[PDB]
Symmetry: D2
Subunit: 284 residues, 4 copies
Amino acid sequence: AVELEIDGRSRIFDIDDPDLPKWIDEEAFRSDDYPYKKKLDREEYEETLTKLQIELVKVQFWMQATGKRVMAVFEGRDAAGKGGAIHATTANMNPRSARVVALTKPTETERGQWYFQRYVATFPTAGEFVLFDRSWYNRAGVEPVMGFCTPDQYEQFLKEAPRFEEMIANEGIHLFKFWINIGREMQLKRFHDRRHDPLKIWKLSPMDIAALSKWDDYTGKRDRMLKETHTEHGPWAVIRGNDKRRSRINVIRHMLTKLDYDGKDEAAIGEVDEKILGSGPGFL
Amino acid sequence: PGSRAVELEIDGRSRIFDIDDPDLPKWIDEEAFRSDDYPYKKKLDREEYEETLTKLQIELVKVQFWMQATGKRVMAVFEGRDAAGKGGAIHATTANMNPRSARVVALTKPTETERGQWYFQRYVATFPTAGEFVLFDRSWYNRAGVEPVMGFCTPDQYEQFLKEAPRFEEMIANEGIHLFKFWINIGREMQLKRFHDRRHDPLKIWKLSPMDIAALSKWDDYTGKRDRMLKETHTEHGPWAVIRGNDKRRSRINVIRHMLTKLDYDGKDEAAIGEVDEKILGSGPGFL
Amino acid sequence: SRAVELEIDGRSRIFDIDDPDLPKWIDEEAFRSDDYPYKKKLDREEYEETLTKLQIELVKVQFWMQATGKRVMAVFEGRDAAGKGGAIHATTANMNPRSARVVALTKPTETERGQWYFQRYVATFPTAGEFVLFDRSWYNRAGVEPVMGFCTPDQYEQFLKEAPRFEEMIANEGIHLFKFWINIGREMQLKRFHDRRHDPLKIWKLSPMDIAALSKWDDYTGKRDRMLKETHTEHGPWAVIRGNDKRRSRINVIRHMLTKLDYDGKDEAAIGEVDEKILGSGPGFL
Amino acid sequence: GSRAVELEIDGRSRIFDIDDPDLPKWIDEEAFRSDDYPYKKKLDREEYEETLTKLQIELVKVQFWMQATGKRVMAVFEGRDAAGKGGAIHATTANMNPRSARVVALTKPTETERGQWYFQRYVATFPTAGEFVLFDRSWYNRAGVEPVMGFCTPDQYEQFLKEAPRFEEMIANEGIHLFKFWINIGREMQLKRFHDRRHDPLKIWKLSPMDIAALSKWDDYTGKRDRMLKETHTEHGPWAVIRGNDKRRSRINVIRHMLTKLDYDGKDEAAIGEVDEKILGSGPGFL
């Protein structure tokens, strides 16, 4: 079990415990000042998603004609729900043009290269929607927190990421960056859900469990990054992710509003929820 | 419309199929499921399917762990007719697998450089490293079906492919990589029904191309190329598993059970695997 | 039947490349064309001697690079027949081909064409220790591509604006980027073309395109100056070489590189001095 | 004498000291004629350059011919350390268009590559239409350096001798023309060229501590050579074996064999000359 300190109070969390203790279970949803008291009605979420998806088919037909290229980054804490936001957007997309980049950790050869090199290799050709599991922003989160990269390297990445993204925007590739937020209790509940589901247990490693008393360590790095890497060229979208249903819908609503695609049905997109989707610093 | 309407011979019987017409004619709609001597009258129960699938996927988590521990490498090839259900079979396999060790290879048309290479060069480029599970959406068997039928390869290149594929697969087997090859069959009416489902679902419409619709009359040619491919390339080192795929639930379940049965993985639970259904999964030519 | 009509600095001549008689006005002017600073070609024995000392320092550079993990890219651009390849071979002849490699990319595929222009060049960037020389670089879009209409004037003007940003990131990373422009005089090009035509070890180096593009000399002069102007920056400076004499061209390319590399075991006496009459910086030299 | 070493030069004990800039006469005077080299002296350099020039003009034809037919060629060069592989390659490629004649110089296997099929990283380098691909080191590092040095397992080395013929059958079935050259030198000759390398500042990087130590492992490598030529010399993959003591004669006859075997358009059989059977032989038993 892990000794913690949740907003002033010292707490005891056993992940191998098949029982979720009261202060996680009852707190998880509202954690981190989540704006809503319960989950989105499911029927209503599913019928919204279908509509958003039918839109995303319009997008991809338009992408194939204009040759328009789109890139989509998803970052967040462990279990913030990057993958479910990714699978929501691509589930009913053509995997020929919409592809998910899942890069393993750098090889030796990749380590002596320009950090951005292996990301460049995955960049879109005419018409491609490229989505990122892990992005070049491991250098602004996991790597300096875990000391997988030097301070100087992290510091260079913060400096180089906007020059990198100016190049992308100047090329006319449309980059989205989504930071997905969850409250501390949610992470714990989700971590626990993974542990006790034989279908999701491979997602945990002892490291992820060791790095639970590194919340603030990660809070620090999050805030540095968003201020320092949110440019006009590369804006950051920040999502409240406690409810995955709301997180998915607003991710897709945001992208749809931002892309000037043929056959765009504004009634079907609806309103990006101001309570859920923000911009850069000042939102969290 | 009636604008893309086409005449078809459905088992020595003439018929017109209009894909843009949102009404599905009874000669398809009522005949789809049992078409081509399908051994069951109804679709596998939805909730039973999901229950069995979950058990099977837990076993796949055991396979993945065993593969990492041992460096073991697997390759799975999925072929069949258009809309046969190759992608759902793959997705059912990898839905709850680690994507950094189970990856899907989906290669696009050959570039100029590639056409001048050895046919297999660009597939070797995707081969597994240790612990990797590689699934092919379209494989090298593109030259055994789609390429000759449409004239994308010469008759000589086809003949040459049928000769070379066994040899290539022997290299794969001697290297210690486990290759599976799945042929997923559906009945003619079921293809049509699926084509129709696709046209009239705005989520699936993109699955249909012009090419797809014209190739509907080329059904008997595909049967020949199919039969000749199974005949020539079913070998000891590279067996064809042949799936009756009218019911996608029984198809996905039996694809996975077969793989689990042939893999000698750690923590294997035969009771959770269950029994491969011999009415659904058969072997090489003659099953079909 | 392949004879071209040309205008050499306010004077009209015809050039038949397939006539083995090199006319006087080429033969007598090839060498000193374009205000070349020297009376004659550098003697062979002295060239070979000096090149040896230079390739020995290149061995020291390689060993330092393997040790410090240092990374170098060397870009070579010029008119046709300038001697880009000769200068690359002079550099790499006595270096380990497993840490010093040459990049010679062919025309872009359908896929590479729909991509970031710089994507396929980034694929070829060095890992630790590596020296990468470019046969044709991203500067084909600041040379052949707009002149020959292979890229749009919008794509050309986009490249001119984007290449210093590219080179900024290269420099920021600490990959040392060398760019050489190899200048030749007009009459020297004609001789070299004719040399290639009438020598069977060299005839494949020609195209009917290169011969057609002889009339395009002044247009190419235009794109040269434009490029050296826009894309000569602090993080990516252009070195300009007078290449009429291939021997002095090669020696100074290497001299420039050794001078700028702060490697262990370096011997200034062995490098000697860069010939300011052969090697200039940026525009305002030609 | 800090890296000096004792050797059994044909049952006769001997001390070689590489870092001594003076070459002992038992090497210097014996190198050229080692391993019963059929000739007394070096091929005259001008005659060599004149011959090479003609061979290279024939190689321009090959290239034009390959581009028009799409014909593909691979050339593998193996031999002991310092046998002369890079030299045979550069004599081939010096006046060829590098846009279609490429030299493959593969570094050690990465970790990813080690868990792949042995041949996968080499298939990645295979020719497209009209390409001529030359290999500095090839897949035959599993037949030689790897077993001897323990970089691969006995099982992997055995695996390799079995698979290489199959691989080469696929290459031949595909219509790609594979040449395989083994370049032999005498023991004394190797030592001389090692010494040349050590004491030439242009060449010293070609020498490694590993290479010096493996000078005792001569007989070891002899065994691997003979066994590899035995198991992998087949009809679809013949080994051409070159006596390479003279680098000029080796380069010339490597090139003549290739010319001789390619039925290229413009072929001037008189310009090719005759392959010297004292220098080039085939498969096992030649040496």
